[PDB]
Structure 1
Amino acid sequence: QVQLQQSGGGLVQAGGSLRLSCAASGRAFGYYYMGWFRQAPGKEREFVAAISWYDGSTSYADSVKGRFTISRDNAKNTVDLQMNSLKSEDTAVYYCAGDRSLTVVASSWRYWGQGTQVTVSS
């Protein structure tokens, strides 16, 4: 069973940096697009980032472009979201998800993680 485990969340000051980790187990880690989704309180899940599995690529949302960095480690089966230049709007639960699909919709990703809480303090 493709299982995603999130870690690295917590409280952090605005303007700082934080790194999240997504530990994945399974035989299909090397064929699945892996990205992150953020769910603001009272808001639906929204795409924030994604990384490819063949060349490496990158794609960030317009709200976080130029501020985030998403990286993958095939040998360790871990996907990380390196975060910098924090702002208060980023206080939300960050969900690791994957699938063969690369979209902005959240309903199209079959597998999800349990989520981690990230709080931005102004």
Structure 2
Amino acid sequence: SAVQLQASGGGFVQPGGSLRLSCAASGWAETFGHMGWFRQAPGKEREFVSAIDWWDTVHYYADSVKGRFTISRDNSKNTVYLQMNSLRAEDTATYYCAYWDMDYLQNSIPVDYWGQGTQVTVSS
């Protein structure tokens, strides 16, 4: 397989606000799999945030961001979108969109590809 991920969005924001991220995929993969976002805090480990199937049927979210982050999909651009609000100080980190190339998701341990880091910073 040969898949390229283009990430867009990020910057400096105020606490409790909303910002913009979106990831597009190109190339060719084995199958139409899941797509998710991964968070890396500075000095910490890389942990997943959520995971959405390609057909927007079932959604999976982490317990730490449930009810605060959401992810949807385009209908004419093949680009995944995500929205967030009520951002807090811990959200300042580097985000990466990742493609999981299997039909049914079991766990977030095996990750196929990674995108360029998008650093988001929130403060007063």
User: Does the Cα contact within 8 Å between 1:30 and 1:53 map onto a contact in 2?
Assistant: no
What TM-score do you get using the length of structure 2 for normalisation? 0.87
AA matched with 2:114: W
Change (3 A) 1:3 1:29: farther
Partner-residue secondary structure (3-state), 1:14:
coil
Structure 2 residues without counterparts, runs of 5 or longer: none
User: Does the Cα contact within 8 Å between 2:31 and 2:101 map onto a contact in 1?
Assistant: no
Give the match for residue 69 of structure 1. Answer: 70
Give the match for residue 119 of structure 2. Answer: 117
| CA apart distance, 1:54 | 3.1
Give the match for residue 39 of structure 1. Answer: 40
In 1, Cα distance between equivalents of 2:94 and 2:62 = 16
Change (3 A) 1:114 1:72: same
Q: Percent identity?
A: 73
Q: What number of residue pairs does the alignment pair up? A: 120
In 2, Cα distance between equivalents of 1:55 and 1:86 = 24
21-30 or 86-95, which deviates more: 21-30
What TM-score do you get using the length of structure 1 for normalisation? 0.89
Q: Tell me the C-alpha RMSD between the 2 structures.
A: 1.8
Give the match for residue 16 of structure 2. Answer: 15
Structure 1 residues without counterparts, runs of 5 or longer: none
Q: CA offsets per residue over residues 33-62 of structure 1, 9 Å max, x none?
A: 000000000111101011112352211111
User: Does the Cα contact within 8 Å between 1:30 and 1:74 map onto a contact in 2?
Assistant: no
In 1, Cα distance between equivalents of 2:30 and 2:37 = 15
AA matched with 1:119: T
Q: CA offsets per residue over residues 21-40 of structure 1, 9 Å max, x none?
A: 10211234970200000000
| CA apart distance, 1:74 | 5.2
Change (3 A) 1:29 1:35: farther
